[PDB]
Every structure is written in C-alpha cells, then in structure tokens.
Write a protein that holds these residues in place. Structure first.
Motif, PDB file in Angstrom:
ATOM      1  N   UNK A   1       0.735  -1.027   0.053  1.00 32.94           N
ATOM      2  CA  UNK A   1      -0.085  -0.016  -0.028  1.00 32.94           C
ATOM      3  C   UNK A   1       1.003   1.480  -0.017  1.00 32.94           C
ATOM      4  N   UNK A   2       2.202   0.940   0.009  1.00 36.29           N
ATOM      5  CA  UNK A   2       3.181   2.195  -0.052  1.00 36.29           C
ATOM      6  C   UNK A   2       3.604   2.592  -1.581  1.00 36.29           C
ATOM      7  N   UNK A   3       2.684   2.032  -2.528  1.00 40.21           N
ATOM      8  CA  UNK A   3       2.867   2.200  -4.022  1.00 40.21           C
ATOM      9  C   UNK A   3       1.783   2.978  -4.601  1.00 40.21           C
ATOM     10  N   UNK A   4       0.972   2.506  -5.133  1.00 41.16           N
ATOM     11  CA  UNK A   4      -0.326   3.194  -6.099  1.00 41.16           C
ATOM     12  C   UNK A   4      -0.528   4.422  -5.161  1.00 41.16           C
ATOM     13  N   UNK A   5      -0.264   4.494  -3.840  1.00 42.22           N
ATOM     14  CA  UNK A   5      -0.742   5.802  -3.088  1.00 42.22           C
ATOM     15  C   UNK A   5       0.052   6.846  -3.454  1.00 42.22           C
ATOM     16  N   UNK A   6      -0.444   7.859  -3.915  1.00 43.75           N
ATOM     17  CA  UNK A   6      -0.280   9.316  -4.808  1.00 43.75           C
ATOM     18  C   UNK A   6       0.967  10.137  -4.410  1.00 43.75           C
ATOM     19  N   UNK A   7       1.279  10.852  -5.286  1.00 44.08           N
ATOM     20  CA  UNK A   7       2.702  11.721  -5.048  1.00 44.08           C
ATOM     21  C   UNK A   7       2.643  12.434  -5.995  1.00 44.08           C
ATOM     22  N   UNK A   8       1.940  13.628  -6.028  1.00 45.81           N
ATOM     23  CA  UNK A   8       1.980  14.673  -7.304  1.00 45.81           C
ATOM     24  C   UNK A   8       2.419  13.973  -8.628  1.00 45.81           C
ATOM     25  N   UNK A   9       2.482  14.967  -9.690  1.00 41.20           N
ATOM     26  CA  UNK A   9       2.899  14.769 -10.896  1.00 41.20           C
ATOM     27  C   UNK A   9       2.207  15.924 -11.653  1.00 41.20           C
ATOM     28  N   UNK A  10       3.015  16.859 -12.457  1.00 39.81           N
ATOM     29  CA  UNK A  10       2.724  17.910 -13.211  1.00 39.81           C
ATOM     30  C   UNK A  10       1.334  18.570 -12.909  1.00 39.81           C
ATOM     31  N   UNK A  11       1.023  19.379 -13.699  1.00 43.68           N
ATOM     32  CA  UNK A  11      -0.304  20.031 -13.571  1.00 43.68           C
ATOM     33  C   UNK A  11      -0.297  21.464 -14.311  1.00 43.68           C
ATOM     34  N   UNK A  12      -0.582  21.470 -15.363  1.00 44.81           N
ATOM     35  CA  UNK A  12      -0.832  22.897 -16.323  1.00 44.81           C
ATOM     36  C   UNK A  12      -1.851  23.733 -15.822  1.00 44.81           C
ATOM     37  N   UNK A  13      -1.977  25.127 -16.662  1.00 43.62           N
ATOM     38  CA  UNK A  13      -2.705  26.064 -16.317  1.00 43.62           C
ATOM     39  C   UNK A  13      -2.386  27.348 -17.300  1.00 43.62           C
ATOM     40  N   UNK A  14      -3.260  27.610 -18.244  1.00 42.56           N
ATOM     41  CA  UNK A  14      -2.731  28.445 -19.407  1.00 42.56           C
ATOM     42  C   UNK A  14      -4.014  29.245 -20.061  1.00 42.56           C
ATOM     43  N   UNK A  15      -3.905  29.434 -21.342  1.00 43.39           N
ATOM     44  CA  UNK A  15      -4.663  30.110 -22.284  1.00 43.39           C
ATOM     45  C   UNK A  15      -4.240  30.537 -23.413  1.00 43.39           C
TER      46      UNK A  15
ATOM     47  N   UNK B   1       0.415  32.692 -30.488  1.00 45.00           N
ATOM     48  CA  UNK B   1      -0.509  33.212 -29.621  1.00 45.00           C
ATOM     49  C   UNK B   1      -0.929  32.112 -28.500  1.00 45.00           C
ATOM     50  N   UNK B   2      -0.442  31.080 -28.778  1.00 50.70           N
ATOM     51  CA  UNK B   2      -0.627  29.826 -27.615  1.00 50.70           C
ATOM     52  C   UNK B   2       0.086  30.276 -26.422  1.00 50.70           C
ATOM     53  N   UNK B   3      -0.727  30.360 -25.372  1.00 52.89           N
ATOM     54  CA  UNK B   3       0.058  30.399 -24.089  1.00 52.89           C
ATOM     55  C   UNK B   3      -0.076  29.549 -23.020  1.00 52.89           C
ATOM     56  N   UNK B   4       0.769  28.934 -22.454  1.00 48.00           N
ATOM     57  CA  UNK B   4       1.038  27.723 -21.645  1.00 48.00           C
ATOM     58  C   UNK B   4       2.003  27.676 -20.596  1.00 48.00           C
ATOM     59  N   UNK B   5       1.621  28.147 -19.301  1.00 49.40           N
ATOM     60  CA  UNK B   5       2.607  28.180 -18.105  1.00 49.40           C
ATOM     61  C   UNK B   5       2.626  26.720 -17.369  1.00 49.40           C
ATOM     62  N   UNK B   6       3.562  25.962 -17.925  1.00 46.99           N
ATOM     63  CA  UNK B   6       3.645  24.651 -17.379  1.00 46.99           C
ATOM     64  C   UNK B   6       3.978  25.001 -15.917  1.00 46.99           C
ATOM     65  N   UNK B   7       3.582  24.016 -15.166  1.00 54.26           N
ATOM     66  CA  UNK B   7       3.587  23.994 -13.728  1.00 54.26           C
ATOM     67  C   UNK B   7       3.405  22.868 -13.069  1.00 54.26           C
ATOM     68  N   UNK B   8       4.337  21.783 -12.746  1.00 60.56           N
ATOM     69  CA  UNK B   8       4.188  20.532 -11.805  1.00 60.56           C
ATOM     70  C   UNK B   8       4.692  20.859 -10.663  1.00 60.56           C
ATOM     71  N   UNK B   9       4.641  20.217  -9.472  1.00 59.37           N
ATOM     72  CA  UNK B   9       5.411  20.022  -8.391  1.00 59.37           C
ATOM     73  C   UNK B   9       5.720  21.409  -7.957  1.00 59.37           C
ATOM     74  N   UNK B  10       6.277  21.412  -6.859  1.00 55.79           N
ATOM     75  CA  UNK B  10       7.007  22.611  -6.172  1.00 55.79           C
ATOM     76  C   UNK B  10       6.104  23.993  -6.549  1.00 55.79           C
ATOM     77  N   UNK B  11       6.316  24.531  -7.753  1.00 59.63           N
ATOM     78  CA  UNK B  11       5.749  25.577  -8.419  1.00 59.63           C
ATOM     79  C   UNK B  11       4.044  25.443  -8.387  1.00 59.63           C
TER      80      UNK B  11
ATOM     81  N   UNK C   1     -10.095  29.782 -16.838  1.00 59.83           N
ATOM     82  CA  UNK C   1     -10.062  30.184 -18.138  1.00 59.83           C
ATOM     83  C   UNK C   1      -8.980  29.314 -18.626  1.00 59.83           C
ATOM     84  N   UNK C   2      -8.800  28.026 -18.185  1.00 66.73           N
ATOM     85  CA  UNK C   2      -7.742  27.179 -18.896  1.00 66.73           C
ATOM     86  C   UNK C   2      -6.952  26.649 -17.864  1.00 66.73           C
ATOM     87  N   UNK C   3      -7.199  25.276 -17.452  1.00 68.62           N
ATOM     88  CA  UNK C   3      -6.434  24.746 -16.450  1.00 68.62           C
ATOM     89  C   UNK C   3      -6.530  23.154 -16.263  1.00 68.62           C
ATOM     90  N   UNK C   4      -5.762  22.414 -16.209  1.00 65.67           N
ATOM     91  CA  UNK C   4      -5.736  21.042 -15.845  1.00 65.67           C
ATOM     92  C   UNK C   4      -4.705  20.486 -15.151  1.00 65.67           C
TER      93      UNK C   4
END
Lengths: 53, 113, 177, 138, 86, 122, 60
Positions: free
Chosen positions: F2-16, F55-65, F94-97
């Motif tokens: 149970x010390x596996x599958x159990x999560x620990x962040x991983x990326x996460x964007x947010x743009x426009x 025109x494509x804007x995309x402020x990458x942001x996983x972990x930490x940030x 207005x755009x985030x995943x």
RNA sequence: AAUCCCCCGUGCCCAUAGCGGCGUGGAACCACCCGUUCCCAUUCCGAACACGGAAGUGAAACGCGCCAGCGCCGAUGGUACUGGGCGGGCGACCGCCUGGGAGAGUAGGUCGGUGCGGGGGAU
RNA sequence: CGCUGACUGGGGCCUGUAGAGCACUGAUAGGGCUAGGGGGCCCACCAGCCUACCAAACCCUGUCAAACUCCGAAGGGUCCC
RNA sequence: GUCGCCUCCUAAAAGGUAACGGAGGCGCCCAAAGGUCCCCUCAGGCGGGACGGAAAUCCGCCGGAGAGCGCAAGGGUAGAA
C-alpha cells in the motif's frame, strides 16, 4: 554570366587592398548594400573583404 | 525504426563520430554513484581498467578530486602499458563539471587529450 | 486406408495411380506414399472433416490424416498432399463443420436468404474428441439481421480457436427486403 | 501482354463500371460453380452483362457469387490517322489466367440454379467450364 | 512561337551507376562503390545496408568511396591478409 | 505495499491562448515558468486563418511551483464534480488542467520498453 | 582417371556462340571424329553442356 | 590475484531478444531519493541537463524467471517459374526430356546467444 | 609481347523481372462492426427514438498492378584459383 | 507536333537499347537550407480542458519514422540530412 536584372546579380569583393578579388554570385533579395567577409589577397593572407561592386 | 531510432536519449552515433579515428575511446562511463571508463581502441580493441571508483575503493572526496584522481592515475596506469595520445570519451552527458573532472585526470594524467 | 510408398520417386509416382502425400507427424516425416485412387474414396468422404488412417505395415494405426494439400493443378485433380497424425491428448487445430436445416423465417415466407461465410469451425475441443457432425441453428432470418461469432453457442469442449462477432451467417435479400 | 500507362497518369483509379458480385443464396456443403481455362482480357461489358443475364433468368438462392473483375484497358483511333499514336482509352476487364475459380452456384439442393449459371456459361464468351466443387453438387 | 500539351511524350535521358570493383578484387585507391557521387568514401570495405549483413572486398589501400546511403559507407576496416609484412 | 499506488503529485498545467502581446505578462507575475508556443490554422472562425502565429500561451507547472498555485488558486474555483475525466486527470476554468499520478504513470515516458501504460494502474 | 571418348554429331552449324568454343576447346576440328580425356570436371563440364553435341564414352 | 553464481560498465550478432500478463531484487549494486549559495543550466521552473549529501524506498526506469495471445523465425514431401535439349498444334499456346527450385500454405520454433573489463559473491 | 583469350570446373561478391505476396500504395468485390447523409416516428433545437436505403474508416471472407513489393529464384555479371 | 537537361516504368533482373511508348519535373534558387560545437526525438491516433464543436493550444498514453528535408520525381535516411 547570364546578366539577369533578376534578384540575380554577380559581384566580388576587394581585400582591403590585399589587392584583387575572388568569385561570387548574389541576390538583392535581402540586405542590399550589405556584403562583407574576409579572405587573403596576393597580399599576405586574410584581410577584411567588402563585396560591393 | 531501427532499434536506435524508436527508443531515445542516447547518441551512440555521436560516439561513432569519434570512432572513425583519433585514438583510444578513453570512454568514460558514468553512473553518479561513481564513474567508470575504459579504453575501446579501433580493432576489436579492449581495455585496461585504467581508472575506476572502486578499483581503489570509492574514497570519500565526492565528484571533485574523485575524478581529479581516478583520471590522473588511470592515465598513470595506461602510459605504463604503452599508449600515449588517447582520444577522449564523453561517454554520455555533456562534459559536466564530473566529466570535466575525470577529463582533468587524463590531461594531468599526461595521457595527451 | 492402406496407401503405401515412401522412397524417393515423385515424378512417375506423381503419375499414374499413385499421388504423393507425405507421412507428417510431430517430430518425424517419411517419404511420400499413399496413392491416386485412395485419396479418392476416403478424401471423397470428408478429408479434414472427420478422420481415419491406413495400415502401412501395421506400422502405426493412427489418425490426424490431412492438415493441408490441394487439387491444385488447373484440371482440378490434386497432386502432392500433406499427412499428419496425432496419437496425443493435445488435439487442437480442430476444424469441423456445422449445419442448419432450413428453419423457415426469411425464406419459405420472405424468400429472403442468408450468407454463411462460416460453415466450418476450426477450433480445439477435447482432443481426439469431436462429433464428426455438429449441428447448431437457433433459427432466425430476414430483414437486415445478422448473426456471427459472439452469440454462436458452443457445446461441451469449450474451445473457440476463433473469436467473437465475425462471419457467422446472416439473411440478405435474394431480391429485396 | 501490352498493358496500361499507369495507375494514375493514363487511366488508373476507377470503378470500371459494372454490376457488383454476390447473388443467389448461401448453403454449407453443396458446391455448385463455374470456371474457365481460357486466357482473355475478359471483355468487361460483355462481362458485367453476361453474369447479370444470369440473375435475369434465376432470381434468388444459387451463390450467384462471381470472382471476376477487370481493371485495365486498351486504346486506339484518336487524332491524326495511324502513325505516332497517342491514345484514347475504352474497355477495361481482367486477365482470366488460363482457367481458375470463376463464379459459384453454391447451395444445398438447388440445381434449379445450376441450370441457371449453365445459362450463365452458354453466354460468357471464352467457352467456359461447367463444374462442381469440394464434394461436387449434391 | 511556343510549345504544346496533350502529347505527354517525354523521353528520358541517361545515367551510369555501378559497383565498380565489385566485392573482393585487387584494391586500388580509387572509386570504390558507386551509386551516389559527391560520395564520401570510407575505410576498406562496407557491410552496412538496407539488407542486413555486410560485404568484404579482400582489397586494401588508402580508402574507397560511398554513394550516400545505398551500399553502406565503409568503416569496418579489412585491409586483407595481403597487407602484412611484405 | 500500500506504499505504492498511493499518490505523490505529478505535473499540472494552467494556461490560455488567444489569436493575439503581454497578456502572458499577467501570466508571469502569478507564477514563474513562462509558456511560449504558437497556435495556428487557416480559416475565419474568429479571424484566425493565420497558420503560423504566436498566440498559444501555456505556463507549465508541476510539483513545487504548482503547489504555491494549487494553493493560492484553489479557493476561487467553485465546482468539484463531473469535470473528472478518465485518464486520472481533469480540466476546469479560463484554462487549467491537472493529471493524476498513480504509481504506473512514468514508465509511459521511456523511449524503450514504453509500456503503453496499463489501465489498471492509472 | 576416367578417360572420356566423345564423337562428332549434329553440326554446330549456326548454333550458339560459346557452344562452338566448347567445340574448338575440348579440341574439336573436323566432323564426326573421336577424342578422349580425363574426367576432369573442367573438360567435363564444357563437353557436357555441349551435350546433345555428340556422344561421350567412358574409356581410356 | 590465471574456476562457477551475481550485478555493473559495456560490446558483436540488424525481432528464434518485440509486445504485453504475472512476478522477484535491494546487505552488496543501481536508480529513484534529500536539498539547492557557488560550477554549469532550462526560450518556464535546477522536471531533463546539475553541484553537493545521511536518513527513506524498491513503487517507478531497470536485471533474471514463467506465460504462445499479438507478433518474429521457420524445415521435409510439395506446386509455379526456368537455364539447356526436342516434339504437337495456323491458334492465343500446349507438352516432354535434364540440372536449378521460392513465397504463401500445416509441423513447429523464440520468449536472445554470446565477447572484454570493473564491483563483488564461492577457505 | 607469349598462354594471358571465347568456353568449362571452383570460389566469393553483386542485380533483384518471371513467379508469388498482401502490413507500403492504389485499385476492387461479398459481407460485419460503426458514424457521416438519409429515411420513417414524438412536430421534430428533437437534437429524443426505432429501422428496411447510401457511405468513410477498423474486422472476417476474397481478388487485380509496368511506373507497388515485408518475399524471391531461373540466369547474367566481375575479381581471383 | 518535336527537338537540352533531371526521374519512373520499358531494360527481360551487371551495365545499356529504338519507337511521334508511357507519365512528370528544369534554364530556379538559399547570403544562410553555408562551416562546425551544442541540444531536439515526426507525422498520426486515442483520452482530458481555454478563447476552441472539422481543422489548434496543453496535459497523459501508443509509435521498423507512414512524417521530416524550399522546389519533380526517385534513393536516402532520426544515428538524422
């Protein structure tokens, strides 16, 4: 060569005097009065080299 | 693709770049935990464990020095064999400060590079 | 049934009354024997649709018969066959037929009919364990209906060396539906 | 075997214009059919036709299936006269490779369809072979 | 005073590719294998090709020359036993 | 384990991104990993025919940030439902995943033995 | 040392280039004449190819 | 220090090593890892490249094994095509005599095999 | 100049038609699964519903190619013995 | 009508051959597609969200490279041009 006032225009470039020149084909296309590069006239070796003619 | 054109990351061919010629593949295989290089020279050549982090234990001087020595020595071990001018082997990553390190080795090692 | 030969003589053999036909089996083969006259009769029955075997030197009276061959030639008269037995309890590659009846649904009332890109059924039930003639026909036929793999309906030996949804046999307009 | 200029420069990429394949009805065993032996850029048209007239005389169950289909073509008179001949197309078909699996009169007991095809051969052109399949015809 | 159409009619001209020296003959510091000029020769024979294996040319001197991709640039040396001490 | 599958962040964007200069400068101040990519196409569904513009804007942001953002930015969004997509991951506003991170995610990154990410781990 | 003894038949008149050489080779002057040799796949070959050429006899 | 088991750098043979299903390993090894002033560094963040270091972990990349479902490999007997020789048909072509003899098509076979060095693991 | 030459035996290295093959490509037929257009039905911003007509693409049964070929011989070549 | 030159097919498989036989390109150009040193891993399909319902933009998976390379084809070939 086939002198064609078509963005196709033949030119050379002196050797600061190194003395004479050396072959080159060109195109106004871009950068008009633009044309510089070094070589080496019978004059020792190297030497800045404008191309304009 | 051919085995080396669907995976990714390596550059082996940027190894074959030096393959052509120049000398021993003073190839330096890294793995943080330590550094290990051989000497693949042309003709189904071979090597002479010229320098390794374990060969003489792994010390306790981290990156810096480690290299500084592993190389030198290495270079020492070989020039006893009868080499002379050996070609460098970035094995991998960019001549990082490690790399560069080891590098020193050779150089200082008197094994011209 | 009988069939002999196995030396090294195909041309003349491959000629007259004796047609080639290898003695194929898991692990070993042996010059082609048989005959262009037996093939007849038996084959005539239902090659790889039932099974028997012949007594050559009483050698090994076993089944499996043909797993390949061809009346190839233009003429349409085979020549150069393949023969493989199976004295094992592994019998898999089992392709035996399947028949309906005529159940009246789209036909004797709608004139409609039905294609059967299937007919056969290469599966693998209980090795040396199959009803030379297996029938299954839940009926149904007409309009834009169709039945294939998936549904089917397999008895005993649970194989299916095959897949689901695929060339079963539907009902199309012999004229119009 | 003179053939055409290419599959997309002269004349290649068509439907050939004809009347599709299947007819008649199913049938698991009964092997009722037709094939040939003659070689001939099977006369499309003539072709298309033929087969069809086949249905014209029967109607329903008897694998009015048929495994043919032209797909290349000739050419001739168009332009000057006889000399340097350019090319004007017309009449595609397919090589009936010295015999082979023609069309199939396939079904249980339905010779009422065998005679048919029969009528189908009569027609055709290059003679034809009247035959049966694995088992015969029931 | 021009040219026409609907007359495709367009003969083609000449080439002249080869393997010159084929595989395993008296090797001379000269045009090795050919099927792409400007070529960039190599070292000894070549064995790399859109085929699999390799080809030896029991003939050794300075070098040979490639063809751009085909054949398979040289590098797998192979001076030949006929390159030892006189 | 149970010390596996159990999560620990991983990326996460947010743009426009709009068929356009600077608006992404309002992007820079909210975080710190500028997105500079070029959208395109060639039609008139907005006047965006230009098939090669920036025109494509995309402020990458996983972990930490992303953390500082997941944080100071997770309060003004009001939903929590549906917007939950299969591939353990989801996109709102207005755009985030942001993507899940079960234990069998990474491998899908290898140039080699690229395990097409099994569907029982993700 | 299987010694072969062939004769001349069916004039090579107009027949294949080489074939002829195999003629003048094996040693083939005037017509319907007889010559002999050692098996030697060499000489052998040639002759054979010439096959129909004439007649071979195992002699010595 | 001149023997086998293991891991690690790593080479040759261009899938009988690939896919994927389950599993096993961390003392040793290796990675992930812990942080980010200075070397260098991201068109955006030290994710990747990167410098310093314990604890934590084998989850993941990974190494050996088992599984034929997808693939890949692939005989024997066999049929086309044909170098050579000679016959039939006006005919498109058919056949014979002699050496060559594939793909696909069932058997079945594969889940690498093997170099050199380094760390150990076997007084 | 003098055994080097056509030819045969041996040995490498090549070409890749004929054939054959369908994963590259372009046809093309019987059909299954499906969404694009239908089509009939709640009157139809309904974008909810069934199904007999045309289809795209994937799947099974099949088939043609000189300007196709994962495959591949007859044979010819060329250096040496 | 057409004559030069680049490619395919024709050439029967070394090379190479007519046909007023098939089809298609060129009498440009690029000063930066130049030289190297340093990094990149394609098209596409699928799944999830702004302005977006073909057709982007990002995020997560699948990939003998089928994209990619100023121009016609053909070879190449990411290791990479």
């Amino acid at each position: 060569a086939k002198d064609g006032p078509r963005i196709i225009v033949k030119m050379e470039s002196s050797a600061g005097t190194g003395f004479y020149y050396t072959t080159t084909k060109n195109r106004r296309n871009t950068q008009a009065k633009l044309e510089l590069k070094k070589y080496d006239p019978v004059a020792k070796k190297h030497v800045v080299f404008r191309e304009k003619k | 693709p051919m085995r080396r054109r669907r995976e990714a990351r390596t550059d082996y061919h940027q190894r074959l770049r030096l393959l052509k010629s120049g000398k021993p593949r003073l190839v330096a295989r890294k793995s943080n935990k330590h550094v290990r290089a051989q000497l693949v020279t042309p003709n189904g050549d071979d090597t002479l464990a010229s320098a390794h982090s374990s060969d003489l234990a792994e010390y306790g001087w981290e990156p810096t020095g480690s290299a500084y020595l592993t190389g030198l020595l290495a270079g020492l071990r070989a020039q006893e064999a009868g080499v002379e001018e050996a070609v460098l082997d970035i094995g991998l990553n960019s001549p990082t400060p490690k790399v560069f390190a080891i590098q020193e080795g050779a150089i200082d090692a008197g094994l011209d590079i | 049934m009988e069939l002999t030969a196995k030396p090294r003589t195909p041309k003349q053999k491959l000629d007259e009354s004796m047609i080639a036909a290898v003695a194929y089996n898991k692990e070993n083969n042996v010059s082609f024997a048989l005959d262009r006259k037996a093939f007849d009769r038996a084959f005539r029955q239902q090659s790889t649709t039932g099974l028997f075997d012949i007594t050559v030197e009483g050698g090994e009276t076993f089944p499996a018969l043909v797993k390949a061959v061809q009346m190839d030639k233009r003429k349409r008269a085979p020549i150069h066959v393949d023969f493989y037995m199976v004295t094992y309890g592994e019998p898999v590659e089992v392709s035996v037929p399947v028949h309906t009846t005529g159940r009246s649904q789209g036909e004797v009332q709608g004139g409609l009919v039905d294609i059967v890109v299937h007919n056969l059924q290469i599966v693998a039930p209980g090795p040396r364990r199959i009803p030379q003639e297996l029938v299954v026909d839940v009926t149904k036929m007409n309009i834009g209906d169709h039945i294939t793999a998936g549904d089917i309906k397999l008895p005993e030996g649970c194989t299916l060396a095959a897949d689901p949804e695929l060339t079963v046999v539907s009902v199309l307009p012999p004229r119009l539906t | 075997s003179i053939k055409p200029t290419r599959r997309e420069y002269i004349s290649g990429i068509p439907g050939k214009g004809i009347a599709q394949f299947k007819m008649g009805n199913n049938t698991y065993p009964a092997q009722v059919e037709n094939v040939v032996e003659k070689p001939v850029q099977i006369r499309h048209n003539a072709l298309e036709a033929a087969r069809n007239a086949a249905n014209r005389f029967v109607q329903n169950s008897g694998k009015f299936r048929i495994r043919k289909f032209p797909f290349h073509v000739i050419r001739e008179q168009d332009g000057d006269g006889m000399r340097a001949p350019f090319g004007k197309s017309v009449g595609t078909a397919a090589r009936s490779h010295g015999a082979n699996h023609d069309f199939i009169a396939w079904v249980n007991p339905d010779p009422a369809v065998e005679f048919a095809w029969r009528r189908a051969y009569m027609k055709v052109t290059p003679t034809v072979n009247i035959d049966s399949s694995p088992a015969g015809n029931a | 005073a021009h040219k026409k159409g609907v007359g495709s009619s367009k003969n083609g001209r000449d080439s002249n590719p080869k393997y010159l020296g084929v595989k395993k003959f008296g090797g001379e510091v000269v045009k090795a294998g050919n099927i792409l000029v400007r070529q960039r020769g190599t070292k000894f024979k070549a064995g790399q090709g859109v085929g699999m294996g390799r080809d030896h040319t029991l003939f050794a001197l300075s070098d040979g020359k490639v063809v751009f991709i085909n054949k398979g640039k040289g590098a797998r040396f192979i001076s030949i036993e006929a390159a030892q001490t006189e | 384990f149970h010390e596996m599958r159990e999560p620990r962040i991983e990326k996460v964007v947010v743009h426009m991104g709009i068929g356009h200069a600077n608006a992404e400068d309002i992007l820079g101040e909210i975080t710190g990993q500028m997105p500079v990519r070029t959208k395109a196409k060639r039609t008139v569904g907005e006047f965006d025919i230009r098939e090669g513009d920036p025109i494509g804007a995309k402020v990458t942001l996983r972990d930490e940030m992303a953390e500082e953002f997941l944080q100071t930015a997770l309060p003004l969004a009001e939903l929590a439902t549906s917007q939950f997509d299969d591939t353990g991951n989801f996109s709102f506003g207005l755009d985030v995943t942001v993507n899940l991170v079960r234990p069998g995610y990474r491998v899908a990154k290898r140039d080699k033995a690229s395990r097409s990410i099994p569907t029982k781990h993700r | 040392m299987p010694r072969l003894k062939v004769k001349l038949v069916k004039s090579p008149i107009g027949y294949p280039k080489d074939q002829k050489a195999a003629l003048k080779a094996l040693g083939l002057r005037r017509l319907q004449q007889e010559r002999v040799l050692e098996d030697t796949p060499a000489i052998r070959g040639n002759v054979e190819k010439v096959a129909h050429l004439v007649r071979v006899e195992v002699v010595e």
